Every structure is written in C-alpha cells, then in structure tokens.
Amino acid sequence: MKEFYLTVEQIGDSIFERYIDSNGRERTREVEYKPSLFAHCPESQATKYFDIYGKPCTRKLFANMRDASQWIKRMEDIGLEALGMDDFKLAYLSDTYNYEIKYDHTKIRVANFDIEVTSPDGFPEPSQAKHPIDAITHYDSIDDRFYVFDLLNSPYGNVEEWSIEIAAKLQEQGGDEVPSEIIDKIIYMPFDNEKELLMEYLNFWQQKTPVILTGWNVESFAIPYVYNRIKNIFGESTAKRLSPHRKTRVKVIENMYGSREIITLFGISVLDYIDLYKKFSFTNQPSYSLDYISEFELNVGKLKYDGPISKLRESNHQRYISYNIIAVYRVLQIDAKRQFINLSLDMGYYAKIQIQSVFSPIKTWDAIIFNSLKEQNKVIPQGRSHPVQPYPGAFVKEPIPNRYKYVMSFDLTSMYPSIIRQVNISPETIAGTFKVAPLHDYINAVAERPSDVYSCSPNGMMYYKDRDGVVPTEITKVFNQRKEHKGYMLAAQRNGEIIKEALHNPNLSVDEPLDVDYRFDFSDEIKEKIKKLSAKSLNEMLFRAQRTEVAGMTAQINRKLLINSLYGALGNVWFRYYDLRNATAITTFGQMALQWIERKVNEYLNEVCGTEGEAFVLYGDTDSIYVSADKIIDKVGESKFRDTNHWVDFLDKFARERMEPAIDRGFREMCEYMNNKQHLMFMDREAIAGPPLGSKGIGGFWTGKKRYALNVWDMEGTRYAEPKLKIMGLETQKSSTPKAVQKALKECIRRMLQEGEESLQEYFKEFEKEFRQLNYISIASVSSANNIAKYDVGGFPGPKCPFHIRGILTYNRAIKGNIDAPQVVEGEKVYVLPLREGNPFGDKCIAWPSGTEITDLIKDDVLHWMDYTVLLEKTFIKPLEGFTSAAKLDYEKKASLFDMF
DNA sequence: TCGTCTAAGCAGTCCGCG
DNA sequence: GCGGACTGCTTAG
Ligand SMILES: [Ca+2]
Ligand SMILES: [Ca+2]
Ligand SMILES: [Ca+2]
Ligand SMILES: [Ca+2]
Ligand SMILES: [Ca+2]
Ligand SMILES: [Ca+2]
Known part of the structure; x- marks a missing residue:
C-alpha cells in the first residue's frame, strides 16, 4: 500500500513523524529536514522558480529549520520579502507525500476517552488536579475495546468492584442497561491505589498510543486533568509520556473576555468531539452537555441517578462506572451518525495538514494552495500584517409584510464560489481597475461596458481571462466533491419520502428490511417490494435512509463550508492571500447578480401575464429570489386542479420549462456584460409553497428581512409525503x-x-x-453568558446590566456560601426565568446553568415565584x-x- | 467563544420626548 | 409608551 502520515511535529531542528509504512505498520521517525525558502532574483538568471506573479526567484537551502527561521527575521530587518512555506512541517509533508493521499482509516488509532474525578468542594479544576482520578474509560478503535480503569480505594471512599453482570441487566432489574452490543468489548481493570492505576494507564498509552484523540470536553477537561494529576503525583517527565515524543506545551487560549489553558501533546492530534460538533453540525444548542446532545442526536434517555455526582461513587459505584462507560459509547454513537471524524480525516489528508488543523480553514486553504502551486514550481508570497477593515456584503430586499399564498423560490448554486470561478478571482489574476458607475447602473444595464479585454466585477476590479487562477482551480475541485455528496444526500431524502408514503399501508406480515444503497434513487423493483413490506421493516428502512441522508449532509454541507470559507479567508487579515479588493469583488458582483435577476424575472413574468410594472419577486436574500405565483395559479384557475399535488406539478413544470430558461438567458447576458471568463450563475427552483387545495390556509407570510414562513410541498426535487414548514429567522x-x-x-x-x-x-x-x-425548564429562556464580572458590582447589577446577567447575579446571591451548588461558567449558556414582584431573591429574574435542573435548595422557591x-x-x-x-x-x-x- | 466573512433581526438598558 | 443610541445575542445568507 501507499504510505501516509499519521502525525507530524517540528521539535527544534527535527521533524518527528508518525506514519503508516508500505506494509501497513505504524512507525515513527526523526528527520533532520532541510527546508527551502526563496528570494526574488534578477531577470538574467536561469531559474525554474517563479512567484505567483511570474517574477523569478532563487531557492535558498538551509542547513536546518532554525537557520531558515533566522533568515526570515533578517529579511524583515532588511525589508525584503521572504517567500515560501514558512510552516516547515507543511513543506515536509508536501515533499514526503507528493501524490494524492489514500489513507486506510482501519490503521489509524482513534481513541475516545473519559475520566471521573470525585470532588466534595466543587468543580475539580484541571490546572490544580488536587483530587484522585477514580475512573478512566478508554475506547481504542483498532482493538475495538473499552478499557476500564477503576479505582477501588480513595480518600473519598473504598468501594467494591464493578460487576459486568449487573451492568448488563435492565434498569427494571436494578441494572445499568449498558448496551448488550458493547458488553463483550469491555476489558475491566480494578486498582488498589491511584498510583498503580495511573502507571498502568501510562504503560497502556505507550502500547496503544492514540493518533486521533477525542471524547467530550477532553481538550478543556480530561487531558489537562490527567496531565496535571500525573505531574503532581510523579513529576513532569512522567506526565510527558502522554506525548510519544515526550514533548508538551501548556498553551493559552485567548479571546475577548479572558483566557484558559490547554496542554498540547506533540505527536497526538486532539479533536475534541464538542468542538467537532460545534463546527460541523450546523446546530445551535441550548446546552452542550453530553447528556443533552445524546438525547438530541440519538433519542436516548438521560443517564439517571440520585444525589449529586460528588456522592455518586460512594453511594453507587456500580452505576458510577457503568455511566462512565456509557458516556464513552455515546460519543462513538454520535460519530457513527454524524461522521465528523471521517470528515476531518478526509479534509486533513486532502490538504496535507495536521488533522487538528481542520478547525482552521485559513490553515487548510493555505496548504491546499501551497501544494497546488508547488506542483508548478511556483513560490507562495510571504504573509503580511494588515489592519482589520470593514467591507460590504450581500444585498437583502425589504419585503412588504404580508401573507403570500403561492410562492416559488429560486437560488444560485454555491453562489460565492461560482462568482470566484466565473469572474476568475484570484491573487495572481488581478489585471487592473476600471472606473465604476453606481451599482444600479449595472443592474439596469445602462452603464458603459467595463472592459473588452478582461473579466469584471462591478466594484471596479478586472481579471485575466487567459488562464484560471489558483483560487478558481482549487475551489472547483472541492466544489465538485460537494456536488457528488449533495447528490447522495438528496437521493436518500427522496428515498425516505418513498418509505413514508408506503408506511400509510403497511402489510400484515413478518419480513426483513431490503438490502439497498440509499444513496441512489430506488429502482422500480425496489419500490414494488417496499409496497409489500411490514411496518417494522419499513421503519427500519426509514431509519437507515435517514442515517444515509445525515451522512450525505455532513459530507456535503462541510465541503460547502470549506469553499465558502475560502471566500471568507480573502477577508481575514491572517490569510496569506487576504485582499479586500477580491473579497469585495465577490460580494459586489453578488449584489449585482441578485438585483439583475430580480429585474429579469419581473420583466419575464410581466410579459407572460400581460401586465406592466408589477412586482412578482417579493423578496430576496444574497442569492435567492421569492416569486409570487398567485397570478400563475389564477390564470388556469384553482377549480381546474384535482388536488394539491396537481398544482404543485404544474408550478414545478412551469418553473423548470419556462422560468429557468428565462433566468439562464438573463444571467448569460450579465456574463457577457461583465466579460466574465465562464457563465456559472445557475439558479434553480428551490421551494414550491402554498396552502392545501380547498383549505383556508394562508400558505406563507413575511414579517421582514430574514423572517418568514412557508408551507412547502416540494424542495429541490423532493416531493414530501406531508407538507413541511420552512420557517426562517x-x-x-x-x-x-x-x-x-x-x-x-x-x-x-x-x-x-x-x-x-x-x-x-x-x-x-x-x-x-x-x-x-x-415544566419550568420547557418555558425557560436561554442565553450565552459573557462578561459576568464586568456587570457584577458587589453581587448586584452594575450600569447597563443585561437581563440574563442580572439573572446570574440573582442566582449567585441565592447560592452564596456554597462551593457545592453548580456555578455559572463564564461564556457558557444559562436558562433564564422572570420572577414575580416581592420574591425572596430580590430581583426580577434568575438564571442557572443550561441543560440542568436548578439546585434543589432554591428550586421550590423559583417554581413558586416564576x-x-x-x-x-x-x-x-x-x-x-x-x-x-x-x-x-x-x-x-x-x-x-x-x-x- | 481558538478556528472564514457581512447583513440584520429582536431583547433589553438608558433616556429623551414639553 | 415609543424609538434612537447602544450592547448583547442569534439568526440568514
Ligand atoms: Ca461524568
Ligand atoms: Ca445558494
Ligand atoms: Ca439548489
Ligand atoms: Ca403495503
Ligand atoms: Ca440561498
Ligand atoms: Ca426598542
């Protein structure tokens, strides 16, 4: 097999690489990599290296990485550009893996772990690590085993061994209901003392060293707790055995309100699942407790117990350990569904970066572009400092607030990436500028044609047409991948609707779900068999179809995220290719495109309806238009339709055969007007919306910009078994x-x-x-809680105190003295409830940590005074x-x- | 909330508005 | 009471 990296690190003048060799074995090597960087050189010098602008460069080969870094500094001192990849490990990977990486996930050791720490005096701070680690469950993907390290003797109590037999039993038998499918995969190790537990854990870690390390809050809690506890007991050298290169760094994470500390383990790629979830899930949750997220994603019940977690080990050690194991399994279940680890590996190996760099689109795109340019012996420019500056974005039409009965929507495919490709927007394709007219002049096609030579955007920028820029080339590759996965997603969705329909008439029989690929539209033979299946088999098939759809959604939406983030990177000062001229070229073209096509669609429909000056487009945001279809329906007359599905078919046919060709013509004209490199403005019908035929439903309404609701029958080719509400904002x-x-x-x-x-x-x-x-939780508002300190004046609200912060301050006074009741954590989320006049809390609201029951000592009073x-x-x-x-x-x-x- | 971008909505504070 | 200046938070793209 072809070799691939697992991890890469720079330590001084050495590259440390863990990798899979040609036989499929994990190996580690230290390499004294000699990096190269570049300087501009005179014209009359036969070189093969050119910068992205075609200027010749000379390659400088350094004795070691420190010399290269020192050279960069001196080039700054002199005031001359130091060109090339300054992140030497990325250059190492590029040199070492000079081909498209095909990786084998079965060889990559993925570890999921979770620890328990009993603490009488409140939250156990990882930086202090003053309490014993009394349980660790560590799942290893290569062994497919849960390794359970259980502390039997502690200063907080001596306990009996955990019983796998009781663990497996139903909760109605007094058991813990640890899922039967993992029971045989548990390797249980009890320990007489904490020192032996941790020493054995480190020996185990040495044998089975994680490549990818994940879990829930492992980066902010479990990893620094384990590191600091081992450090406290054994000293620093022992704690550093968590790194396969024995190197760690205490790294400070900073933002607007303060800072926190994490431990960087060199030679491990930490992908905390909470961070994967927040980046890649496209949810915004009221709480990020594993219990809350597991319920949301998997529909599993809350892990239930009596008393505080601080007394759970001593009261019910059996349950304590079972819940630790279940918590590790829950994360694996979420990943089986969402497939964020798979996504991270795909993206990381594609870009040739450290896998943990997938959180950074700037790092990701920097490596993709570097590797692309390197193939052509081109040399990347030096990153420079720029001040943060605001720049304009999308156009949003002001809708007339109203009901809207029949609506057809249209939307541009991958708008900003398509603009980049169409216009040819790239750092090295800038050709110059032209004198700009007001935007409305281009929208109404009365302004002079910008150029007869170059490809233009209405912000005044011109681009070369002779060759694709590196940004259009690379964005196209990822876009094409996205397109493929979106196809699988939509087929799974359509297949899902076939099953929902059949579920109306389930056959009274005993049978099996069909063995099918849900990524492809069901054949006629499959559809025939589906109509004969039982409800049991149909429900299982529906579950599988929906899981396939989720898998497709993850793959497609995050490729969309990556390409849209390349646009965004053009407007971020830390991107090597930051340029507000290119960022604004994209957004300004976008403003033109929407308003241009609004005009075209209005003109086309006024023509076919024989009206003048009437507005058919009622709304638009960035790249979408919403078209009133009342007059289209009224031209045939409602009485002519057999049922709802009949007028939906008609509008579908009208949109595809009449509207889309008109829209395409309008955009081809705009492409010619701007002299663009390639027509790529493809605006397809999205939603068909309206009330059920014969009903008194209003179909849809808008209250304002980014605020509307539609009753949708068909979305991007999916015809629903039941109408679906599309509610935005x-x-x-x-x-x-x-x-x-x-x-x-x-x-x-x-x-x-x-x-x-x-x-x-x-x-x-x-x-x-x-x-x-x-229930009080179901009627509580939710908010993030930033800057609690800023507004706290002796436990009371200061000037301009936000309502939710006021609630937190009320809470803090009500639990004052206690280092056992839950504390509100700065930057996390709270539930908020208003309080009636004259309450004992002495203020108008109270707030407590979200995803939790309010502590019992004030619960009854909150309930009484809500x-x-x-x-x-x-x-x-x-x-x-x-x-x-x-x-x-x-x-x-x-x-x-x-x-x- | 370490981690690509802007547009724009609503809640709430403070305070004017004779 | 509303709404303007402002902060805070959370959406739609
Ligand atoms: Ca726990
Ligand atoms: Ca779009
Ligand atoms: Ca579409
Ligand atoms: Ca049937
Ligand atoms: Ca859109
Ligand atoms: Ca107001």
Missing part, C-alpha cells in the same frame, strides 16, 4: 426561545399556513389556558402578535354583529 428557529414556546409557535404557524384564522384562534385560546402547567404572565407575554404573545399582524389576521376572535344571537 422566526422565534421557532432560535435557541434562545423556550422549548415549549418554540413548539407552540410552530403549531400556530402550521395552523395559519395550512388551516387558517379560526384554527389559529382555537389553538391560541387553549395554549393560554394550559401553559402554566408546562412569573408566568411575563413569560407568556414576552416569549409567546409578542412574537405571535408579530406573525399575525404581518399576515393580516387575528389570534383572538373579534366581536361581530352575530354575537346578538
């Missing part, structure tokens, strides 16, 4: 809105769009009457008032002359 979509209020507002919207005013009024009247019974009236008015009635006034209807029945009877 409204309170139902915000993590700050209480869970039960999100649910109630969504039902109000469903009724508005599908059923009408009377239905909405029935539901509102019931929610208002019953809501006081809702202000349900304020809660209802603020989270539910206020937003609903906004929805209903925009849609021109009433959530409460107004008086009529019929009341006389």
Whole structure:
C-alpha cells in the first residue's frame, strides 16, 4: 500500500513523524529536514522558480529549520520579502507525500476517552488536579475495546468492584442497561491505589498510543486533568509520556473576555468531539452537555441517578462506572451518525495538514494552495500584517409584510464560489481597475461596458481571462466533491419520502428490511417490494435512509463550508492571500447578480401575464429570489386542479420549462456584460409553497428581512409525503426561545399556513389556558453568558446590566456560601426565568446553568415565584402578535354583529 | 467563544420626548 | 409608551 502520515511535529531542528509504512505498520521517525525558502532574483538568471506573479526567484537551502527561521527575521530587518512555506512541517509533508493521499482509516488509532474525578468542594479544576482520578474509560478503535480503569480505594471512599453482570441487566432489574452490543468489548481493570492505576494507564498509552484523540470536553477537561494529576503525583517527565515524543506545551487560549489553558501533546492530534460538533453540525444548542446532545442526536434517555455526582461513587459505584462507560459509547454513537471524524480525516489528508488543523480553514486553504502551486514550481508570497477593515456584503430586499399564498423560490448554486470561478478571482489574476458607475447602473444595464479585454466585477476590479487562477482551480475541485455528496444526500431524502408514503399501508406480515444503497434513487423493483413490506421493516428502512441522508449532509454541507470559507479567508487579515479588493469583488458582483435577476424575472413574468410594472419577486436574500405565483395559479384557475399535488406539478413544470430558461438567458447576458471568463450563475427552483387545495390556509407570510414562513410541498426535487414548514429567522428557529414556546409557535404557524384564522384562534385560546402547567425548564429562556464580572458590582447589577446577567447575579446571591451548588461558567449558556414582584431573591429574574435542573435548595422557591404572565407575554404573545399582524389576521376572535344571537 | 466573512433581526438598558 | 443610541445575542445568507 501507499504510505501516509499519521502525525507530524517540528521539535527544534527535527521533524518527528508518525506514519503508516508500505506494509501497513505504524512507525515513527526523526528527520533532520532541510527546508527551502526563496528570494526574488534578477531577470538574467536561469531559474525554474517563479512567484505567483511570474517574477523569478532563487531557492535558498538551509542547513536546518532554525537557520531558515533566522533568515526570515533578517529579511524583515532588511525589508525584503521572504517567500515560501514558512510552516516547515507543511513543506515536509508536501515533499514526503507528493501524490494524492489514500489513507486506510482501519490503521489509524482513534481513541475516545473519559475520566471521573470525585470532588466534595466543587468543580475539580484541571490546572490544580488536587483530587484522585477514580475512573478512566478508554475506547481504542483498532482493538475495538473499552478499557476500564477503576479505582477501588480513595480518600473519598473504598468501594467494591464493578460487576459486568449487573451492568448488563435492565434498569427494571436494578441494572445499568449498558448496551448488550458493547458488553463483550469491555476489558475491566480494578486498582488498589491511584498510583498503580495511573502507571498502568501510562504503560497502556505507550502500547496503544492514540493518533486521533477525542471524547467530550477532553481538550478543556480530561487531558489537562490527567496531565496535571500525573505531574503532581510523579513529576513532569512522567506526565510527558502522554506525548510519544515526550514533548508538551501548556498553551493559552485567548479571546475577548479572558483566557484558559490547554496542554498540547506533540505527536497526538486532539479533536475534541464538542468542538467537532460545534463546527460541523450546523446546530445551535441550548446546552452542550453530553447528556443533552445524546438525547438530541440519538433519542436516548438521560443517564439517571440520585444525589449529586460528588456522592455518586460512594453511594453507587456500580452505576458510577457503568455511566462512565456509557458516556464513552455515546460519543462513538454520535460519530457513527454524524461522521465528523471521517470528515476531518478526509479534509486533513486532502490538504496535507495536521488533522487538528481542520478547525482552521485559513490553515487548510493555505496548504491546499501551497501544494497546488508547488506542483508548478511556483513560490507562495510571504504573509503580511494588515489592519482589520470593514467591507460590504450581500444585498437583502425589504419585503412588504404580508401573507403570500403561492410562492416559488429560486437560488444560485454555491453562489460565492461560482462568482470566484466565473469572474476568475484570484491573487495572481488581478489585471487592473476600471472606473465604476453606481451599482444600479449595472443592474439596469445602462452603464458603459467595463472592459473588452478582461473579466469584471462591478466594484471596479478586472481579471485575466487567459488562464484560471489558483483560487478558481482549487475551489472547483472541492466544489465538485460537494456536488457528488449533495447528490447522495438528496437521493436518500427522496428515498425516505418513498418509505413514508408506503408506511400509510403497511402489510400484515413478518419480513426483513431490503438490502439497498440509499444513496441512489430506488429502482422500480425496489419500490414494488417496499409496497409489500411490514411496518417494522419499513421503519427500519426509514431509519437507515435517514442515517444515509445525515451522512450525505455532513459530507456535503462541510465541503460547502470549506469553499465558502475560502471566500471568507480573502477577508481575514491572517490569510496569506487576504485582499479586500477580491473579497469585495465577490460580494459586489453578488449584489449585482441578485438585483439583475430580480429585474429579469419581473420583466419575464410581466410579459407572460400581460401586465406592466408589477412586482412578482417579493423578496430576496444574497442569492435567492421569492416569486409570487398567485397570478400563475389564477390564470388556469384553482377549480381546474384535482388536488394539491396537481398544482404543485404544474408550478414545478412551469418553473423548470419556462422560468429557468428565462433566468439562464438573463444571467448569460450579465456574463457577457461583465466579460466574465465562464457563465456559472445557475439558479434553480428551490421551494414550491402554498396552502392545501380547498383549505383556508394562508400558505406563507413575511414579517421582514430574514423572517418568514412557508408551507412547502416540494424542495429541490423532493416531493414530501406531508407538507413541511420552512420557517426562517422566526422565534421557532432560535435557541434562545423556550422549548415549549418554540413548539407552540410552530403549531400556530402550521395552523395559519395550512388551516387558517379560526384554527389559529382555537389553538391560541387553549395554549393560554394550559401553559402554566408546562415544566419550568420547557418555558425557560436561554442565553450565552459573557462578561459576568464586568456587570457584577458587589453581587448586584452594575450600569447597563443585561437581563440574563442580572439573572446570574440573582442566582449567585441565592447560592452564596456554597462551593457545592453548580456555578455559572463564564461564556457558557444559562436558562433564564422572570420572577414575580416581592420574591425572596430580590430581583426580577434568575438564571442557572443550561441543560440542568436548578439546585434543589432554591428550586421550590423559583417554581413558586416564576412569573408566568411575563413569560407568556414576552416569549409567546409578542412574537405571535408579530406573525399575525404581518399576515393580516387575528389570534383572538373579534366581536361581530352575530354575537346578538 | 481558538478556528472564514457581512447583513440584520429582536431583547433589553438608558433616556429623551414639553 | 415609543424609538434612537447602544450592547448583547442569534439568526440568514
Ligand atoms: Ca461524568
Ligand atoms: Ca445558494
Ligand atoms: Ca439548489
Ligand atoms: Ca403495503
Ligand atoms: Ca440561498
Ligand atoms: Ca426598542
């Protein structure tokens, strides 16, 4: 097999590399890598190296990496550009793996671990590590085993051995319900004392050294705790055995409000699963506890126990250990679903970077571009300092707030990456500038043609047309990968809808789910067999289809994220290729494109309808347009339609055969006007929306920019078994809105769009009457909590104190004295509830850590003093008032002359 | 929240507005 | 009470 790296580090003048050799064996080597850098040289000098602008360069070969680094400094002292890859390990990888890497994940040791630490006096601080580590569960992907290290004797209590037999039993048998599928994979090791546990753990770690290290909060908690505890007990040299090169660094992580410390283990790639999840999941969660996320992702029940976790080991050590094992397994289950480790490996090996660098699109793109240019003997420029400067973004149309009955939406495929490719926007393709007219002059095609030679953007920039820039070339490769995975995702989605339909008529039989690839549209033979299956088999197939769709979603949306982040990197001062001329060229072309096509679509539809000056495009944001189809439906007449699906087919046909060709023509003209390199503005129909045929539903409404709801029957070619609400920006979509209020507002919207005013009024009247019974957590607001210190003046709110911070300060006073009740953590999330006048807490609200029950000593008082009236008015009635006034209807029945009877 | 970008919404504080 | 200046937070792209 072809060799591939696992990890790479620079330590002084050595590169330390762990890798898989040609026989599939893990090896480690130390290499005295001699880097090269470059300087500009005179024209009359036969070199093969040229900078990205075609200027000749001479290669400088250094005796060692420190010499190269010293040379860079002196070049700054002189005031001359020092060209080339200054991150020497990336140059090492490029030289060592000069081919497309094919990796074998089965050879990469992926470790998932979690530790337990009993602490009587509050949260056990990793930097102090003053309490014994009393449990470690470490899952190894190569062995496929959970290694359990269990401390039986501690200053906080001596306990009996954990029993695998009780662990496997149902909770109704007094057991822990450790999943049967992992029972045989547990290797249990009890220990008489902490010193022997840790020494054995280090010997184990040496035998089975993680390449990828993950878990939940491992970077902020488990790793620094283990490191510091070993350091405290045994000394520094022993703690450094966590690094296969015996090198570590205490690294400070800084932001706006303060800083924290993590341990860098040289030769390990730490990918904390919480960080993978936050970057790649495209969720915003009220809480990031593993328990909360596991429930959300897997629909598993909360890991339940009595008393505080600080007394769990001594009260129920059996459960204590079982829950530690289950916690490790939960992370593996989330990854089986979301596949973020797979994603990270794919991206890391593609770019030829340290796997942990996948968190940084700037590092990722720097390496992709460097490797690309190196292939042509071209030399990358030196990174420079730039001051942060604001620059303009997308256009968003101001909608008229209203109901909108029939709506068709259209959207540009991968807009900004397509603009880059179409215009040929790249650091080395800049050709010059032209004199800019106001944007509306280009939008209305009255401005002079910018250039007869170069490819243009309406911000004044011109680009070469003779060859593709490196940015268009590399962005195209990732875009093409994204396109493939989006295809699999959408097929799985369509396949899912086939199963949902069949589930309406499940056969009374005993059978099996079909063995199929859900990434491909089901054949006619599969569709025929599906119609004969039982509900059991259909449900299992639906689960599998939805898992395939999730897998596809991860792969496609994060490739989209990467290419969109290359645009973003052009506007980030730390990117080697930062250039606000290119960043604004992209965004300004984008503004033109949307408003250009708005004009074209209006002109086309006014023509086919025989009207003048009427606005069919009701809304647009960045690269999308929303087209009122009322007049199209009214031209055939509603009475002519057999059912909802009949008018959906008609609009689908109209959009594909009439609108899209008109849109394509409009964009081809715009491409010619700007003299672009290649027409790539492809705007396809997205949603078909409207009320159910014969109903009183309003179909859709807009309240303002970035705030609307639509009843959608077909989305990007997926025809739903049941209509789906597409709600953007409204309170139902915000993590700050209480869970039960999100649910109630969504039902109000469903009724508005599908059923009408009377239905909405029935539901509102019931929610208002019953809501006081809702669980306090389900009606609590949520917020991030930054700068608690700033607003704390002797335990009381200072000037301009935010409402949620005020709640935290109330909480802090109520739990004062306790180093056992949960503390609010700076920068994390809190639940917030309003408090009625005259309460014992002495303020108008209280806040506590999100994803948790409020501590029992104040729980009863919070419950007694909760202000349900304020809660209802603020989270539910206020937003609903906004929805209903925009849609021109009433959530409460107004008086009529019929009341006389 | 270490980690690519801008546009823009709403909640809330403070305070004017005769 | 509203809304403007402002902070804070959270969305849509
Ligand atoms: Ca735990
Ligand atoms: Ca798009
Ligand atoms: Ca599309
Ligand atoms: Ca059937
Ligand atoms: Ca869009
Ligand atoms: Ca206001």
